[PDB]
Amino acid sequence: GELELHPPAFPWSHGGPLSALDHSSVRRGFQVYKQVCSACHSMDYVAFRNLIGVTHTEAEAKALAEEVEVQDGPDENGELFMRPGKISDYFPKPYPNPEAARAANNGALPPDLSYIVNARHGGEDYVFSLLTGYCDPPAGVVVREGLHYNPYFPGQAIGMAPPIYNEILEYDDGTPATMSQIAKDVCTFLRWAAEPEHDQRKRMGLKMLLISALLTSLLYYMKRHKWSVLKSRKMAYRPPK
Amino acid sequence: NLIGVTHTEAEAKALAEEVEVQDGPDENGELFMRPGKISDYFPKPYPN
Amino acid sequence: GRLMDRIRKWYYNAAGFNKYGLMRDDTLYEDDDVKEALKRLPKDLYNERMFRIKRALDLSLKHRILPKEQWVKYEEDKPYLEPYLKEVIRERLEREAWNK
Amino acid sequence: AAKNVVTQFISSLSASADVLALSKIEIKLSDIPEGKNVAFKWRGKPLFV
Amino acid sequence: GIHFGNLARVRHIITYSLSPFEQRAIPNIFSDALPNVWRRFSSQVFKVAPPFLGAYLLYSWGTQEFERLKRKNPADYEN
Amino acid sequence: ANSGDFGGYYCPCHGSHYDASGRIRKGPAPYNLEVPTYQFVGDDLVVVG
Amino acid sequence: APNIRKSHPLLKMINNSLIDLPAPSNISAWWNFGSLLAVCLMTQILTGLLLAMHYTADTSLAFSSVAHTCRNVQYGWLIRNLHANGASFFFICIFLHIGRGLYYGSYLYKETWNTGVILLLTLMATAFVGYVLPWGQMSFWGATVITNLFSAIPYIGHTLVEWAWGGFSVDNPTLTRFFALHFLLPFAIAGITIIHLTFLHESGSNNPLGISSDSDKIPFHPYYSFKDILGLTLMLTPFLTLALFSPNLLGDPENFTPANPLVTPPHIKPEWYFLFAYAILRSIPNKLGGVLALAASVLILFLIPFLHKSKQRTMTFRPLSQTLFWLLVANLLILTWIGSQPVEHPFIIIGQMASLSYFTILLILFPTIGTLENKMLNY
Amino acid sequence: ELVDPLTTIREHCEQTEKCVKARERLELCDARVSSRSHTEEQCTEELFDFLHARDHCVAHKLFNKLK
Amino acid sequence: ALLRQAYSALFRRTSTFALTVVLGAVLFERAFDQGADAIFEHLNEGKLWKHIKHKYEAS
Ligand code: HEC
Ligand code: HEM
Ligand code: HEM
Ligand SMILES: COC(=O)CNC(=O)CCC/C=C\NC(=O)c1ccc(Cc2ccc(I)cc2)cc1
Ligand SMILES: CCCCCCCCO[C@@H]1O[C@H](CO)[C@@H](O)[C@H](O)[C@H]1O
Ligand SMILES: CCCCCCCCO[C@@H]1O[C@H](CO)[C@@H](O)[C@H](O)[C@H]1O
Ligand code: FES
């Protein structure tokens, strides 16, 4: 398919060079990940402790992390045993290895979504449209059995079944679980998940621009000041005659 | 490592085939046992 | 013909080294021959070339040029070195071909 | 002396000894319908069937 | 390592300059500064811009011609 | 695989076009794809070594 | 005796090369890049160590260590950013530092120049290996294509590559030895930089007018030390602005996917500073040709000093050359762009042309315009 | 039963001229192609052109209504 | 005159010049930080965890 459809530019609440993530849309996005994506998509570089001070309280996270049984060990006999989760564990893999996942998704591998937002040309803009944009193949296009059409996805034959539909879950903050409202929140989460610093990164940026403005000017003075001597200088050639 | 030092190439192949090693995962993601190749290290008698 | 002559004049105003008060031969790159030539310059002609440059340099440092009325004019440009140089070169050419 | 110590050190860079034996492959021509291609993790680099 | 003194032979040149504290930070920003910032821009934009503009064009053409060759020509399907 | 002007292959790195025989047809590439010494065994099976 | 700034076998140096150093009273801002490049180097090395203190050169952990470094190390993330981009800012600076030299013919200071070239060559190589450490998809496929370049040489070809990879294909041994390389090379740059500068100090700096400057020189300090601290902050602003406000602008995202020796990505582009090369290698449709064209595309710098025909040193006074110079610059800008584009029409032909024109402006149009010019001054 | 501001505005936009103009071009492509077998043509292009104009529009408003 | 008093008791003695940049910077930091933090927490009202905090911080 020598041709491809590129996505548009939604005005994410945090798009601006001074705009922090929407720490609420993130808490939600998460829920969306935890209650929907975390059944096929791994999040290996994120962990429950990361949530603290960002979207959840310490107490919440503990409980959050305890809703899962992890594999620790060996014990004293040398047996691997299950145990409740601690804030120090990372988000659980839905499969034991890519070989497995593939087999449970028709040979297709649902990629870990930690850095996904930064690994696809378009970022949260693309991830949004893929989620929402699912539709019927136009005239003359036959999508292999097991694959669904999606104009936004390269090749238009995506192995991912449309993951969201109104009310598919229900936010605890009382928010209209419309398809997009979710896709907006989950895409917003992915961002945080992909570069948690984001906030502190832009805050510094500001500070930098401010010092950098002041300091650059202050030096434009001291450079000229000293140089003045050579710029104002005047010379004359006075031979003997 | 035995080859060229204490045993012939042939012998080692056989020697190493006297053991079943744990390779994998396969196509479904299951670990499966398979005969030993000269490239395996001597087997641990315990898992840890 | 009178083409190369109306061409040269253009190029001359084009290079624009006059804007700095520098004669044609003030801007010459100083290889070994030039160096030699410059040493043969009559006391004054040299002290004069000197000023012109130390003045041009002072300009380039200030980022300014000479007011229109002080620029060198294509026909008033004195080739004070060209002769001394062609001699150095002529001289050298000899030593070289003679060493065979 | 010099020639041998350089030789020595220089082959330190070339392939190791833990560079495997090779040759192994299981394939069901049936899993591949007509007109398609598939990648197999073979001896280091891909293998098209 | 000393270069100051052995440089060149200069004769009859007088120079006067003033302490920095006696003169201005940056003077005549308008009666002298800008009007020169311009001159420069003027004299040089005609040697520089040309080829740059020349590129710009070529870039757009190449790009526009490529995106054009991606579209489909009906004359292949009106049969 | 499944791209190019020769219904076979294409290498996006510097644009070499390979056909269904893996033979090099267009691009900077200079030699045809290496072929492994292999053999068939049954109805729908096959192995190399 | 007298002062302890000219007789101390150490202090004398910082004073003999950084304070009393005689400098043309008129060098511009295109002379600043010198220092910046230096500050650039020393700076990369710092972020570099800091980083190396958390990386782990081994295919099965390379990628993850870089992420852990970003996510778990205090300010780690920032520290990467500065390093990752410093590289660019570096290449940028070096690029002007080279153009500055071309325009004002600093290349007449042969030794000071040739070293420069070597320096470039090393920086180029250096960045190459660094880029592979994060073991991403590009990292890999880059490491796989670039090294493969030597396989163009006949006989010792295929064989030379083996050392490189340390195997029969890119794997761990490659990664780890690259990390060694990367850790080491910078220092070599810092070393040659010393020769570079040391050669320059026999002749003094060149200058915009292209004529003797003995007639008036000034102490590096405080004239240029101040001019430079400013220059540094004027360039530092954008570079920080990117690494703080748009970290990934210059960076390909495909490299956020762990290397897969089984799938070469569809949209493959090297980082910007290698595009022009890339374009040329892709312009000639022949393994060897492309390599050779490439090899010369940079190795040509060694010739610039013998392709000088003008009786004057700088272009300041040679409008013709000037236009040809800017034509060359732009010519380069294109080649880069072309590298950013896939192998298809019109691009292929455009690439092919631009290359021809690049090589031609350097090998024939400059020496030719240069001569002509002289005759128009009547020399 | 609630309404996803998306499908509501996806409607509204399909009215903009740009949309219809392309919407029609497709309608037509779809027709000639669906009613003919031993072809080659595909109505992807036409479709994109559509989705492109449509969604672009959706993009300007959608987020106003989302929380 | 402030500048004079300045030049006399500060910028003159190289010893006190320094002593100023120190006690000086100090204040600058303390102050600057506050501002930027404020200019920032303000441009992002109700989006920072510091703002959402009370909806779960059982207190
Ligand atoms: C039913 C398993 C399943 C669930 C649950 C699921 N996905 Fe996926 N997803 C997949 C599969 C399969 C692919 C791989 C598609 C391919 O490469 O053919 C995939 C791929 C992706 C991709 C893009 C891959 C690419 O190459 O562009 C993204 C982005 C993604 N999923 C996001 C999500 C989000 C967000 C959710 C949760 C709100 C979600 N998925 C839930 C199965 C699922
Ligand atoms: C790490 C590499 C390099 C560093 C840090 C470096 C640094 C410097 C410094 C400090 C200067 C003196 C100030 C100046 O003129 O800018 C200098 C001068 C010079 N460098 Fe480099 N350089 C590097 C690479 C190069 C390269 C790649 C070239 C070109 C092949 C080069 C050619 C020169 C020349 C010609 C000069 C003379 C300056 C003049 O014309 O007065 N340098 N360099
Ligand atoms: C010579 C100047 C240097 C240049 C031009 C440079 C450039 C780079 C490049 C291109 C990368 C890949 C960056 C990325 O992942 O996007 C990198 C990675 C790395 N470099 Fe350097 N580097 C330099 C010096 C060094 C030094 C001196 C060290 C320390 C010995 C170092 C340590 C590292 C480490 C740890 C990485 C891997 C982690 C990472 O990718 O962030 N580098 N460097
Ligand atoms: C910063 O590292 C990179 O950009 C490397 N990564 C890539 O190139 C990613 C894509 C890999 C595919 C093709 N690359 C090339 O054809 C390519 C060709 C020449 C060069 C310049 C270069 C040569 C030797 C040497 I030694 C160094 C450079 C660089 C890249
Ligand atoms: C009493 C000493 C306490 C030291 C605590 C170190 C914790 C660092 O706390 C820092 O505070 C900053 C506030 O501007 C945030 O922006 C940073 O993200 C955070 O890491
Ligand atoms: C000054 C002392 C120099 C020491 C030189 C000794 C060179 C070692 O010689 C080595 O001997 C081995 C055994 O046969 C061979 O296998 C190696 O190929 C050979 O390089
Ligand atoms: S490696 Fe395939 S085209 Fe170059």
PDB file of C-alpha atoms in Angstrom, chain G residues 52-203:
ATOM      1  CA  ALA G  52      28.344   5.173  31.391  1.00  0.00           C
ATOM      2  CA  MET G  53      28.001   4.789  35.152  1.00  0.00           C
ATOM      3  CA  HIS G  54      24.568   3.256  34.662  1.00  0.00           C
ATOM      4  CA  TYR G  55      24.646   1.675  31.210  1.00  0.00           C
ATOM      5  CA  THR G  56      25.282  -2.068  30.846  1.00  0.00           C
ATOM      6  CA  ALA G  57      26.771  -3.164  27.511  1.00  0.00           C
ATOM      7  CA  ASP G  58      25.007  -6.458  26.805  1.00  0.00           C
ATOM      8  CA  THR G  59      22.254  -7.093  24.239  1.00  0.00           C
ATOM      9  CA  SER G  60      19.880  -8.548  26.858  1.00  0.00           C
ATOM     10  CA  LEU G  61      20.138  -5.434  29.044  1.00  0.00           C
ATOM     11  CA  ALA G  62      21.421  -2.589  26.901  1.00  0.00           C
ATOM     12  CA  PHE G  63      18.022  -1.143  26.055  1.00  0.00           C
ATOM     13  CA  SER G  64      16.545  -1.592  29.531  1.00  0.00           C
ATOM     14  CA  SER G  65      19.541  -0.044  31.305  1.00  0.00           C
ATOM     15  CA  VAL G  66      19.144   3.188  29.351  1.00  0.00           C
ATOM     16  CA  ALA G  67      15.482   3.348  30.338  1.00  0.00           C
ATOM     17  CA  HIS G  68      16.212   2.508  33.964  1.00  0.00           C
ATOM     18  CA  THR G  69      18.821   5.301  33.789  1.00  0.00           C
ATOM     19  CA  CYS G  70      16.188   7.716  32.561  1.00  0.00           C
ATOM     20  CA  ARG G  71      13.374   6.591  34.840  1.00  0.00           C
ATOM     21  CA  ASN G  72      15.184   5.691  38.061  1.00  0.00           C
ATOM     22  CA  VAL G  73      18.371   7.665  38.187  1.00  0.00           C
ATOM     23  CA  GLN G  74      18.084  11.107  39.816  1.00  0.00           C
ATOM     24  CA  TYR G  75      18.006  13.580  36.853  1.00  0.00           C
ATOM     25  CA  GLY G  76      19.200  10.728  34.783  1.00  0.00           C
ATOM     26  CA  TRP G  77      16.735  11.543  32.058  1.00  0.00           C
ATOM     27  CA  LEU G  78      18.097  15.081  31.806  1.00  0.00           C
ATOM     28  CA  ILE G  79      21.622  13.788  31.750  1.00  0.00           C
ATOM     29  CA  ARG G  80      20.828  11.637  28.771  1.00  0.00           C
ATOM     30  CA  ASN G  81      19.125  14.499  26.967  1.00  0.00           C
ATOM     31  CA  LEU G  82      22.066  16.758  27.275  1.00  0.00           C
ATOM     32  CA  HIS G  83      24.369  13.961  25.975  1.00  0.00           C
ATOM     33  CA  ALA G  84      22.089  12.783  23.187  1.00  0.00           C
ATOM     34  CA  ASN G  85      21.742  16.267  21.739  1.00  0.00           C
ATOM     35  CA  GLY G  86      25.141  17.601  22.696  1.00  0.00           C
ATOM     36  CA  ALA G  87      26.194  15.317  19.896  1.00  0.00           C
ATOM     37  CA  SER G  88      24.123  17.340  17.450  1.00  0.00           C
ATOM     38  CA  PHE G  89      25.064  20.764  18.809  1.00  0.00           C
ATOM     39  CA  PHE G  90      28.542  19.264  18.411  1.00  0.00           C
ATOM     40  CA  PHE G  91      28.147  18.339  14.775  1.00  0.00           C
ATOM     41  CA  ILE G  92      26.472  21.682  14.138  1.00  0.00           C
ATOM     42  CA  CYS G  93      29.331  23.648  15.595  1.00  0.00           C
ATOM     43  CA  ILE G  94      31.924  21.530  13.823  1.00  0.00           C
ATOM     44  CA  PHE G  95      30.130  22.194  10.549  1.00  0.00           C
ATOM     45  CA  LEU G  96      30.357  25.929  10.743  1.00  0.00           C
ATOM     46  CA  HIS G  97      33.897  25.657  12.154  1.00  0.00           C
ATOM     47  CA  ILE G  98      34.656  23.934   8.815  1.00  0.00           C
ATOM     48  CA  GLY G  99      32.770  26.422   6.628  1.00  0.00           C
ATOM     49  CA  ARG G 100      34.461  29.275   8.417  1.00  0.00           C
ATOM     50  CA  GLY G 101      37.699  27.670   7.406  1.00  0.00           C
ATOM     51  CA  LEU G 102      36.678  27.175   3.785  1.00  0.00           C
ATOM     52  CA  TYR G 103      35.446  30.715   3.265  1.00  0.00           C
ATOM     53  CA  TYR G 104      38.402  32.471   4.868  1.00  0.00           C
ATOM     54  CA  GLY G 105      40.903  29.924   3.572  1.00  0.00           C
ATOM     55  CA  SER G 106      42.224  28.973   7.014  1.00  0.00           C
ATOM     56  CA  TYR G 107      43.009  25.766   5.145  1.00  0.00           C
ATOM     57  CA  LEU G 108      46.266  27.401   4.157  1.00  0.00           C
ATOM     58  CA  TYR G 109      47.434  26.521   7.647  1.00  0.00           C
ATOM     59  CA  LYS G 110      47.757  22.964   6.360  1.00  0.00           C
ATOM     60  CA  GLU G 111      48.727  21.100   9.557  1.00  0.00           C
ATOM     61  CA  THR G 112      46.181  22.921  11.722  1.00  0.00           C
ATOM     62  CA  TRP G 113      43.651  21.889   9.076  1.00  0.00           C
ATOM     63  CA  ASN G 114      44.570  18.309   8.358  1.00  0.00           C
ATOM     64  CA  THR G 115      44.383  17.576  12.073  1.00  0.00           C
ATOM     65  CA  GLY G 116      40.997  19.191  11.992  1.00  0.00           C
ATOM     66  CA  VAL G 117      39.970  16.704   9.357  1.00  0.00           C
ATOM     67  CA  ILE G 118      41.211  13.756  11.377  1.00  0.00           C
ATOM     68  CA  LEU G 119      39.261  15.213  14.308  1.00  0.00           C
ATOM     69  CA  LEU G 120      36.077  15.294  12.245  1.00  0.00           C
ATOM     70  CA  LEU G 121      36.631  11.733  11.129  1.00  0.00           C
ATOM     71  CA  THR G 122      36.977  10.637  14.759  1.00  0.00           C
ATOM     72  CA  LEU G 123      33.916  12.572  15.937  1.00  0.00           C
ATOM     73  CA  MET G 124      31.973  10.999  13.111  1.00  0.00           C
ATOM     74  CA  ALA G 125      33.158   7.527  14.131  1.00  0.00           C
ATOM     75  CA  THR G 126      32.605   8.305  17.795  1.00  0.00           C
ATOM     76  CA  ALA G 127      28.973   9.245  17.399  1.00  0.00           C
ATOM     77  CA  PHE G 128      28.480   6.133  15.321  1.00  0.00           C
ATOM     78  CA  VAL G 129      29.393   3.785  18.126  1.00  0.00           C
ATOM     79  CA  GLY G 130      27.706   5.801  20.811  1.00  0.00           C
ATOM     80  CA  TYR G 131      24.439   5.596  18.908  1.00  0.00           C
ATOM     81  CA  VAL G 132      24.572   1.811  18.924  1.00  0.00           C
ATOM     82  CA  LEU G 133      24.835   1.411  22.723  1.00  0.00           C
ATOM     83  CA  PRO G 134      21.132   1.929  23.493  1.00  0.00           C
ATOM     84  CA  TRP G 135      20.622  -1.175  21.384  1.00  0.00           C
ATOM     85  CA  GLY G 136      17.514   0.044  19.666  1.00  0.00           C
ATOM     86  CA  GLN G 137      16.197  -0.955  16.257  1.00  0.00           C
ATOM     87  CA  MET G 138      18.254   1.690  14.477  1.00  0.00           C
ATOM     88  CA  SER G 139      21.216   1.120  16.804  1.00  0.00           C
ATOM     89  CA  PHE G 140      21.224  -2.388  15.468  1.00  0.00           C
ATOM     90  CA  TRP G 141      20.429  -1.919  11.857  1.00  0.00           C
ATOM     91  CA  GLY G 142      22.744   1.066  11.891  1.00  0.00           C
ATOM     92  CA  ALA G 143      25.538  -0.919  13.470  1.00  0.00           C
ATOM     93  CA  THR G 144      24.734  -3.556  10.821  1.00  0.00           C
ATOM     94  CA  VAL G 145      24.897  -1.318   7.800  1.00  0.00           C
ATOM     95  CA  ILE G 146      27.751   0.920   8.705  1.00  0.00           C
ATOM     96  CA  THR G 147      30.275  -1.713   9.651  1.00  0.00           C
ATOM     97  CA  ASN G 148      29.191  -3.643   6.603  1.00  0.00           C
ATOM     98  CA  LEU G 149      30.608  -0.755   4.666  1.00  0.00           C
ATOM     99  CA  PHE G 150      34.137  -2.137   4.974  1.00  0.00           C
ATOM    100  CA  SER G 151      32.976  -5.295   3.289  1.00  0.00           C
ATOM    101  CA  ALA G 152      33.356  -3.273   0.107  1.00  0.00           C
ATOM    102  CA  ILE G 153      37.124  -3.628   0.136  1.00  0.00           C
ATOM    103  CA  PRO G 154      38.093  -6.795  -1.752  1.00  0.00           C
ATOM    104  CA  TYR G 155      39.949  -9.724  -0.053  1.00  0.00           C
ATOM    105  CA  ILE G 156      40.420  -8.294   3.468  1.00  0.00           C
ATOM    106  CA  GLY G 157      36.814  -7.205   3.089  1.00  0.00           C
ATOM    107  CA  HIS G 158      34.362  -9.703   4.477  1.00  0.00           C
ATOM    108  CA  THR G 159      37.179 -10.633   6.808  1.00  0.00           C
ATOM    109  CA  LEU G 160      37.803  -7.160   8.305  1.00  0.00           C
ATOM    110  CA  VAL G 161      34.123  -6.954   9.280  1.00  0.00           C
ATOM    111  CA  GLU G 162      34.483 -10.030  11.464  1.00  0.00           C
ATOM    112  CA  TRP G 163      36.774  -8.235  13.918  1.00  0.00           C
ATOM    113  CA  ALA G 164      34.308  -5.399  14.079  1.00  0.00           C
ATOM    114  CA  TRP G 165      31.321  -7.537  15.034  1.00  0.00           C
ATOM    115  CA  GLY G 166      33.500 -10.003  16.803  1.00  0.00           C
ATOM    116  CA  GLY G 167      31.261 -12.604  15.285  1.00  0.00           C
ATOM    117  CA  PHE G 168      29.597 -13.713  12.072  1.00  0.00           C
ATOM    118  CA  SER G 169      26.849 -11.163  12.551  1.00  0.00           C
ATOM    119  CA  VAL G 170      26.123  -8.311  15.006  1.00  0.00           C
ATOM    120  CA  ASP G 171      25.652  -9.570  18.555  1.00  0.00           C
ATOM    121  CA  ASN G 172      26.906  -9.012  22.126  1.00  0.00           C
ATOM    122  CA  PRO G 173      30.638  -9.022  21.376  1.00  0.00           C
ATOM    123  CA  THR G 174      29.886  -6.140  19.051  1.00  0.00           C
ATOM    124  CA  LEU G 175      27.937  -4.151  21.571  1.00  0.00           C
ATOM    125  CA  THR G 176      30.447  -4.524  24.407  1.00  0.00           C
ATOM    126  CA  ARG G 177      33.424  -3.671  22.269  1.00  0.00           C
ATOM    127  CA  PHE G 178      31.581  -0.682  20.895  1.00  0.00           C
ATOM    128  CA  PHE G 179      31.017   0.565  24.420  1.00  0.00           C
ATOM    129  CA  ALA G 180      34.781   0.262  24.913  1.00  0.00           C
ATOM    130  CA  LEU G 181      35.347   2.181  21.707  1.00  0.00           C
ATOM    131  CA  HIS G 182      32.906   4.895  22.560  1.00  0.00           C
ATOM    132  CA  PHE G 183      34.399   5.258  26.073  1.00  0.00           C
ATOM    133  CA  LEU G 184      37.855   5.621  24.573  1.00  0.00           C
ATOM    134  CA  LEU G 185      37.579   7.712  21.344  1.00  0.00           C
ATOM    135  CA  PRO G 186      36.495  11.041  22.984  1.00  0.00           C
ATOM    136  CA  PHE G 187      39.725  11.153  24.896  1.00  0.00           C
ATOM    137  CA  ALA G 188      41.613  10.636  21.618  1.00  0.00           C
ATOM    138  CA  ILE G 189      39.674  13.616  20.266  1.00  0.00           C
ATOM    139  CA  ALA G 190      40.699  15.677  23.277  1.00  0.00           C
ATOM    140  CA  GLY G 191      44.216  14.546  22.572  1.00  0.00           C
ATOM    141  CA  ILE G 192      44.299  15.450  18.896  1.00  0.00           C
ATOM    142  CA  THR G 193      42.489  18.655  19.701  1.00  0.00           C
ATOM    143  CA  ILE G 194      45.704  19.479  21.588  1.00  0.00           C
ATOM    144  CA  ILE G 195      47.824  18.918  18.501  1.00  0.00           C
ATOM    145  CA  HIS G 196      45.281  20.864  16.404  1.00  0.00           C
ATOM    146  CA  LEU G 197      45.478  23.896  18.652  1.00  0.00           C
ATOM    147  CA  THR G 198      49.187  23.487  19.166  1.00  0.00           C
ATOM    148  CA  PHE G 199      49.824  23.668  15.432  1.00  0.00           C
ATOM    149  CA  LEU G 200      47.638  26.730  15.151  1.00  0.00           C
ATOM    150  CA  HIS G 201      49.763  28.549  17.737  1.00  0.00           C
ATOM    151  CA  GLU G 202      52.847  28.576  15.498  1.00  0.00           C
ATOM    152  CA  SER G 203      51.057  30.874  13.016  1.00  0.00           C
TER     153      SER G 203
END
